[PDB]
């Protein structure tokens, strides 16, 4: 059986660590909800 526990407010944090790139990708979305790359 599945259950939920509260973990916090939905809020923006000004002191947030900043990371990660911003790649631009060609993709396709199939009927099962799976993304795949396209070339």
């Amino acid at each position: 059986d599945m259950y939920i526990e509260r973990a916090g407010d939905i809020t923006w944090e000004k002191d947030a660590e900043v990371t990660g790139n911003s790649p631009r990708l060609d993709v396709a979305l199939d009927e099962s909800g799976d993304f795949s790359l396209v070339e």
């Binding site: 059986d1 599945m2 259950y3 939920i4 526990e5 509260r6 973990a7 916090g8 407010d9 939905i10 809020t11 923006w12 944090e13 947030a16 660590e17 900043v18 990371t19 990660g20 790139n21 911003s22 790649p23 631009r24 990708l25 060609d26 993709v27 396709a28 979305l29 009927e31 099962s32 909800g33 993304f35 795949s36 790359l37």
Partner: protein, 149 residues
């Protein structure tokens, strides 16, 4: 019932299978997390209301309520709730999924599978989508998956 971000847990012992957003009396998560199974909240039960495998989304108690969208220029924050860890905000500039049906924001952040369903936020604090359906390029990239209101 209370607004906020929530762990989705399952039961020998408990495991965190995902994350979701409670807003306006509706619980929002990704289909692959719950497969639409009913959810326990305290002594109450949350019953599914809408779901779609292609969008990989599901809502409980009512229709999908989140409708803010990435503005295409600004940094966002993943409100990651990893298993065993305090909710934490990770700021990033999204990349882009270019598809035949239009462009989708995407975040190049890689957190444990039980983080699936964590909300992505804009600067105003609005949920612009959920984390955890994506592609690999060894690096995982998640779509910013938003439903329709």
């Amino acid at each position: 019932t209370t607004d906020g971000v929530y762990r989705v847990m399952t039961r020998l012992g408990s495991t965190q299978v995902g994350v979701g957003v409670m807003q306006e009396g509706v619980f929002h998560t990704m289909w692959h997390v719950t497969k639409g199974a009913a959810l326990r909240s305290g002594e109450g039960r949350l019953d599914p209301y809408w779901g779609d495998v292609k969008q990989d989304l599901v809502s409980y108690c009512g229709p999908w309520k989140l409708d803010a969208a990435w503005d295409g220029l600004s940094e966002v924050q993943l409100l990651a709730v990893p298993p065993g860890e305090r909710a934490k905000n990770i700021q990033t500039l999204p990349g882009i999924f270019k598809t035949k049906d239009g462009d989708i924001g995407a975040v190049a952040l890689d957190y444990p599978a039980g983080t699936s369903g964590s909300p992505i936020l804009d600067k105003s604090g609005r949920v612009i989508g959920l984390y955890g359906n994506g592609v690999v390029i060894g690096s995982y990239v998640s779509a910013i998956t938003q439903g329709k209101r």
